[PDB]
Design a protein around this ligand. Structure first.
Ligand SMILES: Cc1ncc(C[n+]2csc(CCOP(=O)(O)OP(=O)(O)O)c2C)c(N)n1
Ligand SMILES: Cc1ncc(C[n+]2csc(CCOP(=O)(O)OP(=O)(O)O)c2C)c(N)n1
Ligand SMILES: [Mg+2]
Ligand SMILES: [Mg+2]
Lengths: 543, 539
């Protein structure tokens, strides 16, 4: 018998979702039976709901849609920081919240996971600022309301929220019969882009996170490969293009950019900015020089043609229509590439040498995931090899995000080897999903930067203050504690450059096990970029 | 120079707060220096902010006030489920949120921990339904607004929220010169006195709002003097001294012990103090508490024989019960030994053993699951306390909460009963427990997944399974040797008795006790309760 629950799961299938994350509770168990029963969809239960929301976000970055299931009140409020991060960085995540029967809600009963005030609407209201759309389903409205909020997910690629009462999930439904000025405005915009690109001596394309949101990376890469246009990205939307393309210049990060890149971008006679938002961590704390007078910018929500706002266009089809532009070919030069061989010594591992080694040793078909801290500042500038991706969260910047997110992205694409760089202080927030990693038998390479506390915080304020210290776990021993054998997870401790090179190669050569690699770094050691960034953060926070 | 931050910390000191929980971020480090500097207050840094909010709640249950510190956006939104629990069960917790400089907020800058829309007010608005009061401080308003929201905390004993911009924390202030903070009261007291005077078989019921205000000792003095029959719900368990001769046990609707159920439901007058009737605390609304013969008093409102009353002071009204003369119950109460074998541990025998072996001045903390349903009916010894969260019911709460409460009172031995499934949500505060060298006795019910969920729906469904960790190996992984944390695995009744006594006899180390129970085994109460939850969700 086909139910409202089955209608919702059919629509999630249509979005490309093959795994649902989350945590059970009595208000969602009956719905959960319908996930278990489906051949085309797998329940992947998390230890906690914050982790589920991070994991769904990571999944969405790779699969280009995601869903997780929570219980009313305690589940959804545990996950709201993850949904806020999906809203900030524009990932298409559906949160399903199982709620009490409409009878219990209508009677205002003082049931578990409420404030005992008979009000079942507080928690949906609290989601208003971090959802593109939200609904409390009834038997009557269910199929239309499901389709309205998932259509908002398709239009905006921002998160949405479905409150699913137990009885409403179980109610009868019918399978969907339909799939989930502007065009003239789209054409005027395309014509102006074509004309600016035709006439430009030194154009620069800048792509950002909204390209990733819509799954447009391969479209951008096809566009840049055919046209030979110079391209840069911010660290917000890193891997929005294939970084191995010859016209990829590197990561523009305001005054912290490599000088040749900085000179090229800031001297360009035309800027085409696609899906970019300029944030403190992505602009060297607002030290960028991007002249709007010589810019066409396109975003999901709005655009700017040489400083004139435009509103009525379709972002996705406009980007796709760049592949139709004829008579576009850049004939000029790019910038110097000087990549050195990394030659290890027995020297103690240092931040600058670590990121040199990672850049040298990364392979094609990898996804690099980097946590806020030394890892993001060290890894974000690295040139990726072909067929590769990057996950980082520089705008929301929620530490711990990257561990469940890496696992969710790894589940989304089994054929991309995930390399996670996470700090000791960040791993402590989300460590419990090591249980899920073991159960799912996924094989990411996980590097823990053990520098005895919060080095990025030490670099901003209070380098010797006790609040920057954390309890030192035995990080390499965690897999065994969480139930792994050496047949599943290989643990390592690394102290030297020689060890780092040996262990990274060993891990990459063994795609059939998860690697759990504890890196020992000095608490005083920060990558060259973070040395400068820490003082710019402190200035931004000057009292 | 004395700052707005110093003003806030002086007011928190006045509330009896000696420890501040939370997680640093760039938006709060400069304020945090002021906590470090204070001789009278300790920074106790958590692994994550949800755990900090749970730990502050547990601290508030024992200390009767608490505070924790988060960073703007990512910290505060991580903690909002803990603050919602503190709102639901009425605990006086202050959340301090360090935010960007007013210059950055005023300029609408696209900075980290925002939605890059220049709006710095979304997250404070999202707290409106789960706070008694909230404020965004300015240099101008700081001292008035700090005093306003902490006054709300004193009046309501509900959580409050202070957004503290970097520059506003650092701004000049002057030390406070005084510390912070009728006919209806008398009418209520007169009607209570008259009903108690005339009653043949009165019952007093106390609940969680007594705990909120720290009125347990007042209620205990009132019951000891009057000899009045008293029960509590499992929501507000330990709102009275359970060792008092007139304490009947826990009333839980039709799941009550029969002698207690018969007594409560035949009482000719009911006095409810600080009670809320919730599904988990009434045997899923199978209580029989005739409002025609009831006076109920709550923080926000009262009922005199089904008539609402509004304008009274809950705290002083409870205190004024000690003045009632010509109250002495002259009637009877109800009728109220563990021999272990080598038999495998079962749920029912476990909770019989815990009741037998618990000692005076212990705090029992019990997680939603077999632990709460098993432990909540247990008769406590003198000077004992209980923490459970049956209304909000957020699994994982109890591990950080037990550590918070243990920090709040180092002289009460904390016994935590937490399920395998619940421990997985909040396990990282084992690091804090090791660092702080606190000595709670932690029992982990390893029954290979979510037994309470199996008892409600889908006992054989894979969603009720969890990854089996090596629970006994966690303390070593998190940096404890046996000098700090003693790890044990228990399978038999004889092992359980030996290990619980050994833990109680060693107050100088933390115990980490893995209990092996069958996934199919549930306490007597939960066998019945599970089907009542399932019926409440009947589609
Ligand atoms: C949820 C959350 N809480 C707090 C912060 C503030 N924060 C920014 S980076 C950081 C420290 C990260 O330390 P670690 O992961 O050890 O990195 P590293 O030592 O390599 O810099 C903290 C606490 C945050 N960004 N997110
Ligand atoms: C934060 C949160 N997520 C989900 C739930 C739903 N829930 C209630 S009890 C429970 C399982 C508890 O399992 P465990 O701790 O193993 O207890 P036991 O097996 O002894 O019953 C779950 C998932 C909840 N109450 N809180
Ligand atoms: Mg670190
Ligand atoms: Mg269990």
């Amino acid at each position: 018998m086909y139910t409202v629950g089955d209608y919702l799961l059919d629509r999630l299938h249509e979005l490309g979702i093959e795994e649902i994350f989350g945590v059970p509770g009595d208000y969602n168990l009956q719905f959960l039976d319908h996930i278990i029963s489906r051949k085309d969809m797998k329940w992947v239960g998390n230890a906690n709901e914050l982790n589920a929301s991070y994991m769904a976000d990571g999944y969405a970055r790779t699969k280009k849609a995601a869903a997780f299931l929570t219980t009313f009140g305690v589940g959804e409020l545990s996950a709201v920081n993850g949904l806020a991060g999906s809203y900030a960085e524009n990932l298409p995540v559906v949160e399903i919240v199982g709620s009490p029967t409409s009878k219990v809600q209508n009677e205002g009963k003082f049931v578990h996971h409420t404030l005992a005030d008979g009000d079942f609407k507080h928690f949906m209201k609290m989601h208003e600022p971090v959802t593109a759309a939200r609904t409390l389903l009834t038997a009557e409205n269910a199929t239309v309301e499901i389709d309205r909020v998932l259509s908002a997910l398709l239009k905006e690629r921002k998160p949405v929220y479905i409150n699913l009462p137990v009885d409403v999930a179980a109610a009868k439904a019918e399978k969907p019969s339909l799939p989930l000025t502007s065009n003239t405005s789209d054409q005027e915009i395309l014509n102006k882009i074509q004309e600016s690109l035709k006439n430009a001596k030194k154009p620069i394309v800048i792509t950002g996170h909204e390209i990733i949101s819509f799954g447009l990376e391969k479209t951008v890469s096809q566009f840049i490969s055919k046209t030979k246009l110079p391209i840069t990205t911010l660290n917000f939307g890193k891997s929005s293009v294939d970084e191995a393309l010859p016209s990829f210049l590197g990561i523009y990060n305001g005054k912290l950019s490599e000088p040749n890149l900085k000179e090229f971008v800031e001297s360009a006679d035309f800027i085409l900015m696609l899906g970019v938002k300029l944030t403190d961590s992505s602009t060297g704390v607002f030290t960028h020089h991007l002249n709007e007078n010589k810019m066409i910018s396109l975003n999901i929500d709005e655009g700017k043609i040489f400083n004139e706002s435009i509103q009525n266009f379709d972002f996705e089809s406009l980007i796709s229509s760049l592949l139709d532009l004829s008579e576009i070919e850049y004939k000029g030069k790019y910038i110097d590439k000087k990549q050195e061989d990394f030659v290890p010594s027995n020297a103690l591992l240092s931040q600058d040498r670590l990121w040199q080694a990672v850049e040298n040793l990364t392979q094609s078909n990898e996804t690099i995931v980097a946590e806020q801290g030394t890892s993001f500042f060290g890894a974000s500038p690295i040139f990726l090899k072909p067929k590769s991706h990057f996950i980082g969260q520089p705008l929301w910047g929620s530490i711990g995000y990257t561990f469940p997110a890496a696992l969710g992205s790894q589940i989304a694409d089994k054929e991309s080897r995930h390399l996670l760089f996470i700090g000791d202080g960040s791993l402590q927030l989300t460590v419990q999903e090591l249980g899920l990693a073991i159960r799912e038998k996924i094989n990411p390479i996980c590097f823990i930067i053990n520098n005895d506390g919060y080095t990025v915080e030490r670099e901003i304020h209070g380098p010797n203050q006790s609040y920057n210290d954390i309890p030192m776990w035995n990080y390499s021993k965690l897999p065994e504690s969480f139930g792994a054998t050496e047949e599943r997870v290989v643990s390592k401790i690394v102290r030297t450059e020689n060890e780092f090179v040996s262990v990274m190669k060993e891990a990459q050569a063994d795609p059939n096990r998860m690697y759990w690699i504890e890196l020992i770094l000095a608490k005083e050691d920060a990558p060259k970029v973070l040395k400068k960034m820490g003082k710019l953060f402190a200035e931004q926070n000057k009292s």
